[PDB]
């Protein structure tokens with residue numbers, strides 16, 4: 001029987017440790033999308049999220065990250081190539097904690113992702129939901145306080161370490 005993977009991010013604020021956020025990845029529903037995020041979190045392909053930042057945090061909306069090639073929301077790449085397809089839209093944006101793929105149009109998933117801090121149902125069926133925060137929503141809420149209405153962060157929010165549990 002297969003068990004959904006768990007991954008962790010250790011978050012830092014201007015280089016100062018903040019806490020750990022862990023995620024369940026719904027490999028049972030979106031295996032290809034789950035596997036991308038899993039492998040980018042372990043670094044096992046030779047690239048991934050360790051050291052990258054959350055480039056846009058909008059309080060009461062979402063925290064977005066995963067651009068480890070241009071560091072500002074314009075870059076990123078998947079373990080399958082520069083981009084990969086939308087797998088399915090089985091799972092919906094039901095509330096805070098949902099983990100979902102950022103994109104630039106149909107079938108443009110790469111490495112960027114977002115963590116919901118509110119229900120974002122208008123994104124259903126165009127962003128692939130593939131996971132959820134398991135532990136450490138308090139740390140996501142602490143990260144959120146460094147966001148702003150236009151998404152610029154007031155301190156640098158980084159993934160100091162990440163991997164699989």
Ligand SMILES: C[C@@H]1NC(=O)[C@H](C2CCC2)OC(=O)C(C)(C)/C=C/c2ccc3ccc(nc3c2)[C@@H](C)NC(=O)[C@@H]2CCCN(N2)C1=O
Pocket residue numbers: 056062064073074075101102103104108110112113114151
């Ligand atoms: C739609 C967005 N896509 C990207 O960020 C992709 C990247 C390349 C693959 C992912 O970047 C692009 O398309 C370009 C480089 C053209 C930048 C767009 C951009 C810039 C600043 C924004 C400021 C604010 C907003 N949207 C913004 C969107 C508000 C309204 N929405 C969001 O913050 C949503 C939340 C769900 C995740 N999420 N952002 C995305 O998936």
